Amino acid sequence: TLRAAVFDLDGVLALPAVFGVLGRTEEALALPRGLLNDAFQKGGPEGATTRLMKGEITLSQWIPLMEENCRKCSETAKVCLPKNFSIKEIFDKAISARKINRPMLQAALMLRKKGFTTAILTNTWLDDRAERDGLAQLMCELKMHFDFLIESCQVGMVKPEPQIYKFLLDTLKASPSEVVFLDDIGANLKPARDLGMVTILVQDTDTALKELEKVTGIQLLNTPAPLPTSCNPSDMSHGYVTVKPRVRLHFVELGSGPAVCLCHGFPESWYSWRYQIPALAQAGYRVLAMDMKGYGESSAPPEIEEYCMEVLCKEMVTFLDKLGLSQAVFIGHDWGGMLVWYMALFYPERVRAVASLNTPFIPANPNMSPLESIKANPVFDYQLYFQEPGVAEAELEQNLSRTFKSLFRASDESVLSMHKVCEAGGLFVNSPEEPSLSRMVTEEEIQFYVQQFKKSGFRGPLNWYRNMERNWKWACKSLGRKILIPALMVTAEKDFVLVPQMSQHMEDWIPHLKRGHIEDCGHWTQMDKPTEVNQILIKWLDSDAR
Amino acid sequence: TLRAAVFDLDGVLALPAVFGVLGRTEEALALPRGLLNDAFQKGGPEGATTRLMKGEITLSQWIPLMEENCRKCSETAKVCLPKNFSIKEIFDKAISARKINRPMLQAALMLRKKGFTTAILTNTWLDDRAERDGLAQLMCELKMHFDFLIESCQVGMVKPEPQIYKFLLDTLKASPSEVVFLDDIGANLKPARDLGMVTILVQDTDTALKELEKVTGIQLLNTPAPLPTSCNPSDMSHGYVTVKPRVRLHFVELGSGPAVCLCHGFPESWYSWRYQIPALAQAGYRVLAMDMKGYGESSAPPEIEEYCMEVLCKEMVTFLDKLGLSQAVFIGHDWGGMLVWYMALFYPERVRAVASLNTPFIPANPNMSPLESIKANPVFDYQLYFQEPGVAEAELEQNLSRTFKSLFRASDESVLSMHKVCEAGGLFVNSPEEPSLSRMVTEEEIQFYVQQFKKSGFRGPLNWYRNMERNWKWACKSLGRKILIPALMVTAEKDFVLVPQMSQHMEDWIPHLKRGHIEDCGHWTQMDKPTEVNQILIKWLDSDAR
Numbered sequence A, B: 001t002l003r004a005a006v007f008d009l010d011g012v013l014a015l016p017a018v019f020g021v022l023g024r025t026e027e028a029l030a031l032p033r034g035l036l037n038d039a040f041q042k043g044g045p046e047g048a049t050t051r052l053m054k055g056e057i058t059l060s061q062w063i064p065l066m067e068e069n070c071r072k073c074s075e076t077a078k079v080c081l082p083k084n085f086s087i088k089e090i091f092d093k094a095i096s097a098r099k100i101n102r103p104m105l106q107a108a109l110m111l112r113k114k115g116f117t118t119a120i121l122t123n124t125w126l127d128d129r130a131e132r133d134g135l136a137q138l139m140c141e142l143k144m145h146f147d148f149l150i151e152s153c154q155v156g157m158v159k160p161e162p163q164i165y166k167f168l169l170d171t172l173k174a175s176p177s178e179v180v181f182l183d184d185i186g187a188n189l190k191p192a193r194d195l196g197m198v199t200i201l202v203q204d205t206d207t208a209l210k211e212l213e214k215v216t217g218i219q220l221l222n223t224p225a226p227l228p229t230s231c232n233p234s235d236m237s238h239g240y241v242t243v244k245p246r247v248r249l250h251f252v253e254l255g256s257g258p259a260v261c262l263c264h265g266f267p268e269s270w271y272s273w274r275y276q277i278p279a280l281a282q283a284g285y286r287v288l289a290m291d292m293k294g295y296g297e298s299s300a301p302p303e304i305e306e307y308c309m310e311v312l313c314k315e316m317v318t319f320l321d322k323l324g325l326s327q328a329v330f331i332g333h334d335w336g337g338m339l340v341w342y343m344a345l346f347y348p349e350r351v352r353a354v355a356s357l358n359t360p361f362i363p364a365n366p367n368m369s370p371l372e373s374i375k376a377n378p379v380f381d382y383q384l385y386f387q388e389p390g391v392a393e394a395e396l397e398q399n400l401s402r403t404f405k406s407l408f409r410a411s412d413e414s415v416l417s418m419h420k421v422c423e424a425g426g427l428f429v430n431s432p433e434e435p436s437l438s439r440m441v442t443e444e445e446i447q448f449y450v451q452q453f454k455k456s457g458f459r460g461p462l463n464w465y466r467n468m469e470r471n472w473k474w475a476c477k478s479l480g481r482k483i484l485i486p487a488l489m490v491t492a493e494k495d496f497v498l499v500p501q502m503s504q505h506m507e508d509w510i511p512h513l514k515r516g517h518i519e520d521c522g523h524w525t526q527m528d529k530p531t532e533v534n535q536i537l538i539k540w541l542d543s544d545a546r
């Protein structure tokens, strides 16, 4: 029975094959057929290309040897290479044109999800070209999804030599009959076949994937749209910044490029952005996913006033100061969404661009108490239940697994009576002790939130709602301002509290505001509709956040 | 007696004054004298500029009000503003031309070093211009050097109103007679003077600094060249990445831009780069200063093989993978310098550029054992003392303060007999029990290293020298390669072990190698000559690392 799948890089996980450019160049330049492919393989196991693939020499040392071989081949075929012939140019274009073969990666991802050990086995080179970063980027994106990456130039062995196959089996800790090996070169399949491995000659991806599903008995073709890549907490870079004597802020960091600071809502974590972090980093951004003050590995002081917007915003500015960041793009959800609008209003010089999921920008009404304003809308009643210190903490901390399983549910799975919370005596009075697992989350994802909330509980997080008068007084100072920096408002059709219509007047205060809208999306936006959140955010980032 | 110094921003800590552009524009456009300055102050305390400075409105809301005032003033003076007159253009140019007044900052730095509480008190605005980042950058660089930053637009008060002065005194927790107040506007000095504060009207910096030194009794003018800004460990962003089950890597992070990964030597810390971190971040780079494997907050497994170059390099690649970085510039010193050359040789696709301080690149000699090669040079004898597990650990761990005070000394303070270590029975046999403090370090800086080494000791750090045969075998695989990516070699005149002449053949293997050289520099390069290290690295980064 199969328990391992091995994939080649060129012509299998990455298309078009770099090899096939030797043929295309021949046709474009009207050179004798196979001339470039002949000079490429010249000398066979003793040749320049084999030395390159074994790591004896670098790609830049190989370029003049290939040119020298191209001349000798043309001299024999009684032909002349054009005025401006360049192996460097040919390969630079070929390498940058090569992209990930998405359905092949999807199949490898699906096999690994079903318990398979996966690996990339490739005949490759040590790339020291001025433009080597393009290929470094491709290898980084691909390799993360596999258990092993075996590169000929690092191991000093090359396919079709029998030793590399014995090396692969030792790395996999598997018998050859347990292995599927996919390659676009028949000669390179041959030793794997002769050893007893199942082999697939890859020409078109579709036929290769049909052969792959028939032999594994796992559906890989025509399968539903996969979720974006998530985060394994133990594999992330974890950062810690002391913003003041008793306050440290924790964040997870991924990628290079303009800093994108992600600000979760209540009662969440950096992990609420798990489906956005790999996507935004891959789109060319340096993601900083916060544990907001009161949460996870960040400090959680008990004082209510430690959680007013003025204090929270000041601390986020210090967070940027200590990291040496002059600016960051601020993206928030729920309470994080409220914080990001006030970062834009009070510190525009520090905010590259601002985006909010669900949370509209509504200015303070200076002729009405915030307590009065909130009583007007019956959907905001649950926030009055949060006012009395200790009441909501006791119910939310009682059973953590029940708390998160009850809260994190899609719009058509809701188990909560949001009205009338105070009167009913609690959020979960008509809710089960053992809620069923929502289709949005796994048991393990719930257990991550449970473990995070074991440290500081719900006091600090609930304190965010306990500064309505302080926040109102501070917000009134901004009543003559407008938000004029790049801004995005993302509405969720089925958020029954932060309703899309509440954002309707925003253009009066943010004239150049851009919008996104997600149909059939509840309150837990990032995990409810991750693919669409990523599409909207990446599109807005590339256009407005530089 | 004075214990606090307060500085204005425009015309005092930053020059040329943004105000003075109103006058220059008048002269350039041949407009009536004081016309632009009149429309700027139009309406006085009730005017548009006062509302701006109090934070009632943003800079972009103010621009059309200023234009409207400029028209009314021109209509009265019976003049016509030119075809293409733009307040936006005038102020964009004025703000970007304004730079830090270096000698004024140096004086504030010197006063704070002598126990003074320092603050910036400024009449400023909420900047929402498309080009606001330039000013955000300036405020970030300046503010870090002061105890307090009081901005009119954040406090809703403005100079010369008496309330802002009472607010300043409350923030300083000082009586007015204890305060020196420096301002370029006479009207703004007046309430501070009337309260009993010492006031300096700032026209030219030199005269202002003479007045400042006469009143404080502290030399501020003609004082020696200051050291670059250092790091306070508790104020840095601390990052943590698990590279494998038993191995976590710690780093300090500062700045935005291309990632620059700093790799210390033996027996050091991320803190050895304390004078480079703020400088490189200010030059436009994202600095990642490592605690290398075996050190500080990074894991220190006991096995010798955990510290061979192959393992260390692989882990540094995983470190980049987990952070989502496709590349980084690698800068190393001593053992870190050796690691960076092999990162360039084995992983060029992941290395944006490579630089080494003191450590030359010398290829493996495949016809000689590394143990033989090292015996040939008597300066490398101390490395043989490091071979036997437990011997060097015992002497180095015996008295940590003695260890670091003995090691970290300039070329003309050396206390160590580097020959013949093994024969003499130790590094510190002819060294004092209580070494005098080197001119390069403070007691507090030594105590930081002492506290760091209390965690894991010297086993992991010494293990870096215990893989000579393993490293030699791995290095021989690279003998046919060349380093062709951007590279910098920095030599230290007085490093008696890693001598400048040892780097002489490097061009044979790195043909496009760039060089730097530091005269009168010992082995502890970063702390011995910080200003010159920063100049060489910043110059090479801006030219070759993009």
Ligand SMILES: CC1(C)C(=O)Nc2ccc(-c3ccc(F)cc3)cc21
Pocket: A266, A267, A382, A407, A414, A418, A427, A494, A495, A496, A497, A498, A522, A523
């Ligand atoms: C799902 C539902 C109704 C919706 O449609 N919008 C919101 C907003 C907040 C909460 C919420 C958050 C925390 C908590 F403890 C209780 C309820 C729940 C919801």
Ligand SMILES: CC1(C)C(=O)Nc2ccc(-c3ccc(F)cc3)cc21
Pocket: B266, B267, B382, B407, B414, B418, B427, B494, B495, B496, B497, B498, B522, B523
């Ligand atoms: C200062 C001096 C001689 C010099 O000029 N070059 C070097 C290189 C290494 C060490 C050193 C490092 C660690 C240790 F434990 C002992 C000596 C000491 C030196």
